[PDB]
Amino acid sequence: MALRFPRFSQGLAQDPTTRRIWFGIATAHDFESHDDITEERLYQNIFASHFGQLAIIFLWTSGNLFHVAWQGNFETWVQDPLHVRPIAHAIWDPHFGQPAVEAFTRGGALGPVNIAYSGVYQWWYTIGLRTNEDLYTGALFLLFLSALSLIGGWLHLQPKWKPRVSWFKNAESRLNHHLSGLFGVSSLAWTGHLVHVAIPASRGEYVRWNNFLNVLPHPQGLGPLFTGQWNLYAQNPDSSSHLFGTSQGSGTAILTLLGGFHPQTQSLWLTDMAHHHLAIAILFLIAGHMYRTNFGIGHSIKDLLEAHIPPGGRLGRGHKGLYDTINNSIHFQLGLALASLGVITSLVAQHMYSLPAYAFIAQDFTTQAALYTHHQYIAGFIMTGAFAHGAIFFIRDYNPEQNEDNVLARMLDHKEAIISHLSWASLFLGFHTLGLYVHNDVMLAFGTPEKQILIEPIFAQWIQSAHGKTSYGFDVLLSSTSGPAFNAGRSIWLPGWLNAINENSNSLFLTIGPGDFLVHHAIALGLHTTTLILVKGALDARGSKLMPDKKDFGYSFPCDGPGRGGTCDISAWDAFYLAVFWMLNTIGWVTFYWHWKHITLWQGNVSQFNESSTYLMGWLRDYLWLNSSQLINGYNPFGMNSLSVWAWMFLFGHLVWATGFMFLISWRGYWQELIETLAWAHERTPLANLIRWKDKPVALSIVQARLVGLAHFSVGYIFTYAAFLIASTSGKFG
């Protein structure tokens, strides 16, 4: 195809400069823009790449399992879990000094080790997996699955098995199989695990592969299921005294719907999760048999979209022609996919802390913070990518003549209204949230905290009171005993749910206040503003009044010159790039709120947050300055402690967060005219005229340098906050 390293692009291969290297790294996975590309070859490369990603996922999980099996104290952790530290992996750093080996020796280890703040200990212990040989077996099996995915990705690149373009565009059979099998049979099989293994493992006996065909998950065994007497699977719910991992207080039920938490572990019941995965398995197996594949029954998604045109034309032509703008467009598919994935990742984060599924994962506090922060930053990034790929769809894959007047072209018909009302909502939220925060800053400054504007969140307290939280006296559907909701569920799950939510110590529907109102509106500002930037870049991806031919310039291009006033950062890529800043800000707000509310809950002084979260010097003093003491003292002149690595990573994240400012503030032109002097000096320095570059050393490109600054910025954001949130939450542990 080409000659030099970007073999996929003969435009960068025919680039004498160093831009070749960078852009060939960056555009390597943009198969749509490569030379000699076809839709068939694009789809096949995507399929093989998905196989490679699955292989790397299984390899990374096998690595986790191996390093907990080899270097972990997991066999000791399953004895006294809430008073023994997890161990992620060992450490062999030949730069370590002897004090750092004395300090990083934790968890009763033969040497220095790292504390698993990821929760794999709790999750593996909850699903069975007691001894280290079980984790070894799991790592072997996931190595096997990695090799299997690599085999599949190589096999589906050969001509005898290269699938056709019309096979990846079978958008009915794929939904049918993925709902029925990938979502339903997989949830059914996880119920099979939770019933044959994890529930017996929680109740003592260790049902493993050698003895699972001759033990009964329920003492009757498939009589209740086939005879329909399913209540027999909810007979002995191991009520209120069960010790996880031992048969004391255990039971026989496997699918009892109890609601609420275990008393000991403060996690959900494995019977609850078994029944859950069973229920959604039935629902997904039912929902699978919907789309017509080969058998003369089912729906055609075309004639569902084509048929959903409202009379009166309030939408216009409706979804007439939208099957073709998604089936033939992989960027629409990717945008919708990442939208759903970001929504459910945020949901994972928001439910795993308040409804923790793993044993003794609510008791280790650093794990919950790391997990919530992880999944929320992942969700914000995935959401930013959903929108970026919607913009890339509007540029690369959108055909206006195919979808005239439909529900998607009507976006661009009135994109100014969407953008301007998002620009109203975000502007309102910021003006008023910041005005109230600054009012409270000044009131606390002037020594009159009684003059604060502490707007109670009545509308969330009312929802909490609609769930059984008897902390506000609203007497709503589940806080009121005389109601239809507290009658049709008072016999099934509301006992456990009420006794869990009313507990002030867990994370289930925390008692909120005016600081929670104010920070929720900061969160709304962040979501609305990131949405504004992204939607504005997506709808102005095809063009605007300042650059109506933007679609001809692609997604990522630097600018349109200084003319017409100035067109810096006009691309949809640039909108994405600014929205990553606003996204990281938004998730920093949501996670600062989470971590301070939770560290104040875990410490005990919820009053600290309730009186200090309403003014920003409370966030700077009582959260950032206060909780960062044990962090920045990770290495002092007279010694160090186990938080030395988190202090170093804190400062490292500061350093790269600041280095991104070099690429964001300082732009090109200064650097090309610097490297011209450097090239002069190298070509005129004796004993270095001998050495000459092969790639002409140009400065970084513009859009590239926005990316590089954003990468340094985000790496520093993430590393800084990870260090602070783990060090502060591990320096004291509640």
Partner 1 sequence: SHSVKIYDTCIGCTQCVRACPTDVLEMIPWDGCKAKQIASAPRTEDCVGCKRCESACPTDFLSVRVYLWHETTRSMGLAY
Partner 2 sequence: WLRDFLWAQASQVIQSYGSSLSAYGLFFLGAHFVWAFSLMFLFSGRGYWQELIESIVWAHNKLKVAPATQPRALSIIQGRAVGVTHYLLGGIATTWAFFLARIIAVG
Partner 3 sequence: PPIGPKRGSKVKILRRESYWFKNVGSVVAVDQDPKTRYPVVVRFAKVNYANISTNNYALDEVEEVAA
Ligand X SMILES: CC1=C(C/C=C(\C)CCC[C@H](C)CCC[C@H](C)CCCC(C)C)C(=O)c2ccccc2C1=O
Binding interface with ligand BCR (CB under 6 A): 332, 335-336, 339, 343, 386-387, 390, 393-394, 538
Region near partner 2 per CB under 8 A, out of 155-163, 276-284, 363-371, 438-446: 438-446
Indicate which single residue of 228, 296, 484, 563 sits in contact with partner 3 (rule: CB under 8 A). 563
Which residues are annotated binding-site positions for [4Fe-4S] cluster? 559, 568
Provide, rounded to whole angstroms, the least separation between the CB of residue 568 and partner 2. Answer: 2
Region near ligand X per CB under 6 A, out of 69-77, 157-165, 683-691, 697-705: 697-705
How many other CB atoms are found less than 10 A from the CB of residue 372? 23
Region near ligand CLA per CB under 6 A, out of 178-186, 234-242, 313-321, 616-624: 178-186
How many other CB atoms are found less than 10 A from the CB of residue 682? 15
Q: Would you list the DSSP string of 278-330?
A: HHHHHHHHHHHTTB-SSSS-SB-HHHHHTT---TT-SSSSTTTTTTHHHHS-H
Residues 520 to 549 in contact with partner 3, rule: CB under 8 A: 543, 545-546, 548-549
Binding-residue pattern over the window 676 to 695 for partner 1, x denoting contact by CB under 8 A: x--xx--x------------
Residues 596 to 625 in contact with partner 2, rule: CB under 8 A: 616-617, 620-621, 625
Which residues are annotated binding-site positions for chlorophyll a? 654, 662, 670
Alpha carbons 477 and 484: distance in angstroms, whole number: 7
199 contact partners, CB below 8 Å, separation of at least 6: 217, 254, 270, 271, 274
Residues 1 to 20 in contact with partner 1, rule: CB under 8 A: 11-12, 14-17, 19
DSSP code of residue 261:
B
557 binds partner 1 (CB under 8 A): yes
564 binds partner 1 (CB under 8 A): yes
Residues 536 to 595 in contact with partner 2, rule: CB under 8 A: 536-537, 540, 544-547, 559-560, 562, 565-571, 574-575, 578, 581
Say if CB 541 and CB 559 are below 8 A apart: no
Alpha carbons 517 and 437: distance in angstroms, whole number: 11
State in Å, rounded, how far the first CA of the chain is from the last one.
Answer: 59
- How far does Cα 226 stand from its chain's mean position? 40
Provide, rounded to whole angstroms, the least separation between the CB of residue 684 and partner 3. Answer: 44
Alpha carbons 630 and 650: distance in angstroms, whole number: 12
Provide, rounded to whole angstroms, the least separation between the CB of residue 696 and ligand BCR. Answer: 38
698 binds partner 1 (CB under 8 A): yes
Alpha carbons 635 and 647: distance in angstroms, whole number: 7
User: Where does residue 465 rank: exposed (0-12), middle (13-18), buried (19+ CB within 10 A)?
Assistant: buried
Provide, rounded to whole angstroms, the least separation between the CB of residue 551 and partner 3. Answer: 11
The letter for the amino acid at 151 is I
Say if CB 523 and CB 433 are below 8 A apart: no
Alpha carbons 592 and 590: distance in angstroms, whole number: 6
Report residue 606: phi and psi, to 5°. -70, -25
Beta carbon nearer to partner 2, 442 or 458: 442
Binding-residue pattern over the window 291 to 330 for partner 1, x denoting contact by CB under 8 A: ----------------------------------------
How many other CB atoms are found less than 10 A from the CB of residue 48? 19
Beta carbon nearer to ligand BCR, 418 or 434: 418
Provide, rounded to whole angstroms, the least separation between the CB of residue 608 and ligand CLA. Answer: 25
Which residues are annotated binding-site positions? 559, 568, 654, 662, 670-671
- How far does Cα 583 stand from its chain's mean position? 13
**C-alpha distances in angstroms, 622 versus 135, 413, 608?**
41, 49, 8
Beta carbon nearer to ligand CLA, 183 or 360: 183
Indicate which single residue of 241, 639, 696, 733 sits in contact with partner 1 (rule: CB under 8 A). 696
213 contact partners, CB below 8 Å, separation of at least 6: none
Say if CB 115 and CB 107 are below 8 A apart: yes
Which candidate, 242, 279, 186, 495, places its Cα nearest to that of 359?
242
699 binds ligand X (CB under 6 A): yes
Alpha carbons 281 and 613: distance in angstroms, whole number: 42
Indicate which single residue of 671, 679, 695, 734 sits in contact with ligand X (rule: CB under 6 A). 671
Provide, rounded to whole angstroms, the least separation between the CB of residue 560 and partner 1. Answer: 7
- How far does Cα 156 stand from its chain's mean position? 30
User: Where does residue 469 rank: exposed (0-12), middle (13-18), buried (19+ CB within 10 A)?
Assistant: buried
119 binds ligand CLA (CB under 6 A): no
Beta carbon nearer to partner 2, 535 or 718: 535
Indicate which single residue of 178, 668, 682, 732 sits in contact with ligand X (rule: CB under 6 A). 668
Alpha carbons 708 and 259: distance in angstroms, whole number: 48
Q: Binds 700, which of ligand X, ligand BCR, ligand CLA, none (CB < 5 to 8 A, cut-off by type)?
A: ligand X
Beta carbon nearer to partner 2, 274 or 631: 631
DSSP code of residue 90:
B
Residues 428 to 467 in contact with ligand CLA, rule: CB under 6 A: 430-431, 434
Alpha carbons 491 and 503: distance in angstroms, whole number: 20
Beta carbon nearer to ligand X, 282 or 662: 662
Provide, rounded to whole angstroms, the least separation between the CB of residue 598 and partner 3. Answer: 50
Which candidate, 726, 695, 520, 550, places its Cα nearest to that of 628?
726
Q: Which two tokens stand for residue 348?
A: 């994972």
The residue to which tokens 């309102």 are assigned: 428
662 binds ligand X (CB under 6 A): yes
Indicate which single residue of 10, 131, 186, 264 sits in contact with ligand CLA (rule: CB under 6 A). 186
Applying CB under 8 A, the residues found at the interface with partner 1 are 11-12, 14-17, 19, 548-549, 552-553, 557-558, 560-564, 672, 676, 679-680, 683, 696, 698
Applying CB under 6 A, the residues found at the interface with ligand X are 568, 662-663, 666-668, 671, 699-700, 702, 705
Applying CB under 8 A, the residues found at the interface with partner 2 are 415-417, 419-421, 423-424, 438, 441-442, 444-447, 533, 536-537, 540, 544-547, 559-560, 562, 565-571, 574-575, 578, 581, 616-617, 620-621, 625, 628-629, 632-633, 636, 651, 654, 661, 664-665, 709
Applying CB under 8 A, the residues found at the interface with partner 3 are 543, 545-546, 548-549, 563-565
